[PDB]
Amino acid sequence: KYRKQVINRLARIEGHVRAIKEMAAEGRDCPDILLQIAAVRKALDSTAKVIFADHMESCL
């Protein structure tokens, strides 16, 4: 049903949030952290667009 690339992107975004969590836990500098949050929001936005394109009929 969903292309493997969709599932994989979601898996990557998962590891990315995990890392951001670990950045916070290690006391990394805030701008580093907020940079990565914004990158994840963008990746999620692209992923939703891809899914919407692939499954438009059922997404509407």
Next chain:
Amino acid sequence: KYRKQVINRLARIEGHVRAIKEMAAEGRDCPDILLQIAAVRKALDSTAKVIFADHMESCL
């Protein structure tokens, strides 16, 4: 350095993306999936705001 609540939110958002990944892998309906993506984007946005408030001096 970061409040435990920040770290924990990031941990929750992590499990949430994991679930979304599993929704995709199981062929869940697209609107369900896109609903959860949007919820994660919002959680991430709130988390960045919290961090920015707590560490404004070093985030600027």
